[PDB]
């Protein structure tokens, strides 16, 4: 049957004559085919949110119904392209229309129906065997960097009847036919999945491997774990987008899905421009990093309703690739934008408001979304171990942490990277407020450091204590000037200041600091702490002597050595061997030892 | 007992959020339980929250999704919800709705008990007087508890309150049966919390005497309304019927509050402070006081719920209302956690009704109250002088001020700072307290009477 457009108001549309409808069913409204979802029923009337700008819609316009809920088409061809809030390849659309603007009711296939794909069936696939879901039954070298696997969709089982031979195949060509109870059914290399349904798993597993970030600050002090979760609040201009870009460029993961919702499209242009040039080395081959990334975008000026759809689509794709046997991370940008969209839709429904005008179920939705993370043993007889990590970014209005959005997110994630506006004002570009930041993955990670970098463990603790002690003095320094403190205090203050100016600071846009390997950070911290304790012990041992070593004497003795220690950060990961920089650090340490003993 | 054939209704006149509005129901009953069939074979359940005329309102436990006005049907039972009850509930785990989450089958309901409980005469209740040893010096001593009391644990996000709960459950015992059975209930937690608690419980081999429930973050929100009451009903049965001394651990009551907010906002009922509905004061009264001994019976109910604290707001509605009901509170502060203190417990805002439980005559020792009070006052003055220190430099302080600062420092370094798995005895903590007292001379013992002072100080 077909409904009719009883009334319109903003992005919401009431439709009569919809007796057979149900919640969360896709619908089409207008003479143009505007996609939407149902959100409220009342007798024969219904309510529809629409993902297109609403204008030029009459009453009584026909409305079509379909029993399919919102879904995404999953398969090859995804990477290297870009999609809208709903699954719609922008590049294909732009080639189709030959214009600048997106048509109001453009409708094109999610994936190409003409590209050909090589195929290799499994070496254990015999006629009459059973796989009962989750088993890979073929391989496709979609791109040189990453090879797409195809597995039986879940909730499927039955004996093998037909197997496609090795070779080339286009979409919708019969790959595998399966017979269970006298019913025959065919599958291709593309399938469908509802967006809001959680993909089943065999079991969730604990985190056991660190996920590096390429920043001296984050890896050293507030590390994140593979398969974990986190959030990054902070006012505008604190460089959240920069951190997201750096993580996407230099992670340890295989595949990265960047979901930008409600931002400038110039960021999308930056991603489109920079990533193709940059290359990364695995398997003895150098490949443009676009092959290992997929991009979902929703510019700010687009209609409000699509934004939730974008956030859901992104995690659905991440899920599909976690099932594939890879570690993947996500860059969820500005989930507060999603909150804003919820606020608007609830506003047009005359629903009772909650704190700060947001709907009541904001917390529930955020918890449900962030729960999907975690390491996973997957379904299937050939066991694989995958994982999903979500690195969310929050944008609290006013720059404080009182809005319900941020407080809600704090109660779910395990790692928290606060940013402070004054620090970014300082041009301390990676503005991380170590004081407020914290991480709850300190445990279940000490084994990794004990197995590789055992010395790092005391070192970081010492640095943290030094930072805290600096803070604990700074207020009394500010209230009352100097010349009222012991030598140890001023020494600790000054070394903490140099830590601040050098170690914490990191300019990722110079060619030589775009990325910092972990061992460089370890060596830097080792040199710093060695110098600190050596100086402190030296001055302490002369406390009761006839010649008390003061800080001015230390400066006169070691100004040039301090200068070299400051310039220590000028070590390019390329064009300079690991061995030579390590030897340079060792030689500097020996110099520090000699200068101390000479005194 | 028997009943007539049940009735099917297909008159779904609307759907709105977690609610479903029907009509043309014949003789609807308030708080009646119903079932729901979907266009597929999937089944659900719910209850009735409102009734008027032939119209009725139906809350759905599993949420709302794909509901139709042409295929979905409804079934009406004949009475309030009544749930399985048996001794076999131990050694088993269940979801938010009490179905078996492990592979074991549906428990055999030796009896059926009303979820809503039933009132008890105040005259037929007995004061709880037996101090329960915990081993934490911050809890034993300053804020001693008894067998039958209830104490919430105020905490904020990012704090290790779960570790504290595990430590308490491990070392629970009596000062001088064998131990307590455990009725644990989770209210919308992530997999980490549940897994950690499971690991802790199986570490001590206490699964033979734990019945546990699980409501995870992925589950439908509405289930949290019913989840804790099941655990409380089961615990009530084990305590007042099997005469077993039980310990019920609730957690994340804020999620319960959120679910209640959902229900109220859906019904467009009059809101109050911060959009919270008015009547959760009554509701929290219902969920909280189900504890304490009774005349002529053995066993007891000790209830330790855990409440997360939005931001750092002591005046927030949820913790404030919980303050008006429970007889105590144990506070957690992020300051101590930043200072690397494994039990980060700010003793100043904490308080309990050890008020006549830890007498000493017959109980542990006679000096208990005096030492507790003197430590409390000295700690308060220590915080005061610490605040004064940030104003004027160290040189302006008198000798007594430095003594207070040193006493404070050594106090958190020794008394508060306790390592995990450390089972301190009450006598040990009293002795530690005395050693801390010895820092000052006897003349600053403004609170200890003469007799105890001359008895122990030398």
């Amino acid at each position: 049957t077909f409904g009719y457009v009883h009334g319109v108001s903003g992005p919401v549309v009431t439709a009569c004559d919809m007796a057979g409808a149900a919640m969360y069913e896709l619908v089409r409204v207008g003479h143009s085919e505007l996609v939407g979802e149902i959100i409220r029923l009342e007798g024969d009337m219904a309510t529809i949110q629409v993902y297109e700008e609403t204008s030029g819609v009459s009453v009584g316009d026909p409305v079509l119904r379909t029993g399919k809920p919102l879904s995404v088409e999953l398969g090859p061809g995804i990477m290297g392209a870009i999609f809208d809030g709903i699954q719609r390849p922008l590049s294909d659309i732009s080639s189709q229309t030959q214009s600048i603007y997106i048509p109001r009711g453009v409708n094109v296939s999610a994936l190409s129906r003409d590209i050909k794909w090589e195929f290799i069936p499994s070496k254990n696939l015999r006629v009459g065997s059973h796989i009962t879901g989750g088993d890979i039954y073929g391989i496709v070298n979609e791109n040189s960097l990453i090879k797409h696997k195809i597995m039986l969709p879940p909730r499927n089982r039955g004996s093998v009847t037909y197997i496609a031979p090795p070779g080339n195949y286009d979409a919708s060509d019969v790959v595998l036919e399966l017979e269970f109870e006298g019913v025959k059914e065919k599958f291709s290399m593309v399938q469908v999945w509802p967006v809001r349904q959680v993909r089943p798993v065999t079991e969730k597993l604990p985190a056991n491997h660190p996920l590096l970030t390429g920043q001296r600050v984050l890896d050293a002090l507030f590390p994140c774990v593979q398969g974990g979760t986190t959030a990054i609040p902070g006012a505008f201009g604190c460089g959240k987008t920069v951190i997201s870009q750096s993580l996407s460029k230099y992670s340890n993961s295989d595949v990265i899905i960047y979901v930008g919702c409600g931002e400038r499209g110039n960021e999308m242009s930056e991603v489109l421009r920079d990533f193709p040039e940059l290359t990364m080395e695995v398997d003895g081959k150098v490949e443009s990093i676009m092959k290992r990334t997929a991009l979902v975008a929703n510019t700010s000026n687009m209609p409000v309703a699509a934004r939730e759809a974008s956030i859901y689509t992104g995690i659905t794709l991440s899920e599909y690739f976690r099932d594939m046997g890879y570690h993947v991370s996500m860059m969820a940008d500005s989930t507060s934008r999603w909150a804003e969209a919820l606020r608007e839709i609830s506003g047009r429904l005359a629903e009772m408001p909650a704190d700060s005008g947001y709907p009541a179920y904001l917390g529930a939705r955020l918890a449900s979304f962030y729960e999907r993370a975690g390491r996973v043993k997957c379904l299937g007889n050939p066991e694989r171990e995958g994982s999903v990590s979500i690195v969310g970014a929050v944008s609290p209005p006013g720059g404080d942490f009182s809005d319900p959005v941020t407080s809600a997110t704090l109660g779910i994630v395990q790692v928290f990277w606060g940013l402070d506006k004054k620090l970014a004002q300082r041009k301390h570009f990676p503005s991380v407020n170590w004081l407020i930041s914290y991480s709850k993955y300190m445990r279940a990670l000490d084994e990794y450091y004990d197995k590789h970098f055992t010395e790092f463990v005391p070192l970081r603790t010492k640095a943290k204590e030094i930072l805290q002690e600096e803070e604990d003095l700074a207020e009394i320094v500010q209230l009352v000037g100097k010349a009222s403190l012991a030598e140890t205090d001023k020494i600790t203050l000054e070394v903490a200041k140099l830590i601040k100016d050098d170690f914490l600071q990191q300019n990722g846009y110079t060619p030589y600091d775009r990325f910092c390997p972990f061992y460089k950070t370890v060596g830097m911290l080792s040199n710093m702490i060695s110098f600190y304790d050596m100086a402190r012990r030296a001055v302490e041992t002369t406390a009761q002597s006839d010649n008390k070593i003061t800080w001015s004497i230390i400066r006169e003795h070691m100004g040039e050595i301090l200068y070299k220690l400051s310039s220590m950060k000028f070590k390019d990961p390329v064009k300079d061997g690991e061995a030579k920089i390590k030897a340079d650090y060792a030689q500097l340490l020996e110099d520090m030892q000699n200068a101390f003993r000479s005194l | 007992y028997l009943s007539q054939p049940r009735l099917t209704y297909k008159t779904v006149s609307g759907v709105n959020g977690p609610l479903v509005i029907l009509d043309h129901v014949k003789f609807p009953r308030y708080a009646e339980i119903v079932h729901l069939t979907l266009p597929d074979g999937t089944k659900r359940s719910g209850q009735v929250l409102e009734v008027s005329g032939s119209k009725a309102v139906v809350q759905v436990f599993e949420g709302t999704s794909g509901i139709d006005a042409k295929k979905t049907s409804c079934e009406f039972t004949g009475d309030i919800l009544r749930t399985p009850v048996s001794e076999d509930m131990l050694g088993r785990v269940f979801n938010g709705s009490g179905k078996p989450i492990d592979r074991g089958p549906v428990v055999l309901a030796e009896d059926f008990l009303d979820i809503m409980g039933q009132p008890i005469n105040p005259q037929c209740r007995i004061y709880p007087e037996e101090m329960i040893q915990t081993g934490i010096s911050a809890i034993d001593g300053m804020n001693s508890i008894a067998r039958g009391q209830k104490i919430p644990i105020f905490s904020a996000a990012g704090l290790p309150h779960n570790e504290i709960a595990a430590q308490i459950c491990r070392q629970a015992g009596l000062v001088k049966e064998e131990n307590f059975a455990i009725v644990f209930a989770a209210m919308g937690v992530n997999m980490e919390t549940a897994r950690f608690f499971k690991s802790d419980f199986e570490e001590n081999g206490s699964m033979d005497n734990v019945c546990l429930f699980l409501n995870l973050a992925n589950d439908p929100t509405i289930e949290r309304i019913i989840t804790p009451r099941l655990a409380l009903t089961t615990a009530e049965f084990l305590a007042y019927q099997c005469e077993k001394h039980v310990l019920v651990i609730l957690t994340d009551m804020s999620s319960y509050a959120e679910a209640l907010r959902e229900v109220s906002a859906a019904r467009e009922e009059v809101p109050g402070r911060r959009g919270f509905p008015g009547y959760m004061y009554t509701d929290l009264a219902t969920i909280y006081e189900r504890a304490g001994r009774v005349e002529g019976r053995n066993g007891s109910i000790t209830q330790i719920p855990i409440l997360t604290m939005p931001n750092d707001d002591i005046t927030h509605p949820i913790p404030d209302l919980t303050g008006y009901i429970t007889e105590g509170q144990i506070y957690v502060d992020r300051q101590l956690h930043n200072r690397q203190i494994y039990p980060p417990i700010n003793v100043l805002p904490s308080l309990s009704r050890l008020m006549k439980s830890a007498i000493g005559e017959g109980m542990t020792r006679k000096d208990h109250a005096d030492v507790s009070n003197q430590l409390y006052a000295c700690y308060a003055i220590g915080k005061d002088v610490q605040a004064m220190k940030a104003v004027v430099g160290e040189e302006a302080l008198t000798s007594d001020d430095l003594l207070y600062l040193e006493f404070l420092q050594k106090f958190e370094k020794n008394f508060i700072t306790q390592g995990p798995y450390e089972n301190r005895t009450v006598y040990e903590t009293l002795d530690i307290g005395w050693q801390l007292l010895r820092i000052f001379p006897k003349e600053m013992l403004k609170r200890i009477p003469q007799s105890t002072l001359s008895e122990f100080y030398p």
């Binding site: 005359a350 009772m352 408001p353 005008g357 | 467009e268 009059v270 809101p271 959009g275």
Partner: peptide, 13 residues
């Protein structure tokens, strides 16, 4: 104020 005004307006029906 906003919440109260909303419920008041709804009270008409």
């Amino acid at each position: 104020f906003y919440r109260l005004k909303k419920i008041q307006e709804k009270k008409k029906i």
